[PDB]
Amino acid sequence: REVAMTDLCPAGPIQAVEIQVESSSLADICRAHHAVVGRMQTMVTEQATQGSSAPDLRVQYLRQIHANHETLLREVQTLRDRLCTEDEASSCATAQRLLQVYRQLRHPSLILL
């Protein structure tokens, strides 16, 4: 579907096309995301060296994205340190939380502008 987003771009929300996938199995989401990201890598590297580049805002939302990424980065680092120390509940809730982080990140992923 088409989704125009004004607080990404400074002037013109291009009417950026969003691509979604919903399933019971997170495995099939991993796979179909993996496939599509592959196809977008291909398209963007064949279009680059010919196509131009739009400007961004530089402000507010790239910083929102920085903050919400840095909290999860330090959380993953604390989780890795805990996995190295090996106290108790070796890796069950750790897996269940890491995959929560994964799902959280995947829903918006690579707004390409």
């Binding site: 993996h34 790239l62 980065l73």
Partner: protein, 220 residues
Amino acid sequence: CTVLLQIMERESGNCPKDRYVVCGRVFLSLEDLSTGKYLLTFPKKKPIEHMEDLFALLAAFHKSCFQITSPGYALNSMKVWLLEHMKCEIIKEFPEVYFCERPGSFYGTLFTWKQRTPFEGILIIYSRNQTVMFQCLHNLIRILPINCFLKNLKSGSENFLIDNMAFTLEKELVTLSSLSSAIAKHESNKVSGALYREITLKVAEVQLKSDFAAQKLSNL
């Protein structure tokens, strides 16, 4: 038969490296078998001292990988079930392989036992069909503790897959923090869409790793 070993690089998405090697040639004849020389035919070739012969087992035998946890209790009854009940010989050369010599319907079966964190071990069954892998878990489940949680493993152990997932996500989150930090010095010096594209390609290259490790974990 000519033998041909192809080598492909993963890291380079250019398919640049398609190196082939020719590692020699196999001749074989009905006479050469008629006179043994190559064959593995059982109990005569019990004392395993040509390691090629071990390797031709661990190739042609159906394998099956199993996670074991006795969570509130240490696990050493494995070592007794292998050496006394199943009547195993350790191969000295490779002391992590056990060859079953009990002389009814487990003869010529091989195991391996990595006991990492003596609660949480891992057991791998090379067998001469499936019915023999079943006969074994049956016979094993009989001897284990009450809490002992078996599990089938297609594609590696849970500790390694969580480490793989953790690494791929830490890398990706580092790349996105890097995106925003490269934007946050451009502000001090409106963004180059070219720069944004350049960094999204690196982020894509790490996202493909996280998606892969996630499909490994989400089946388990």
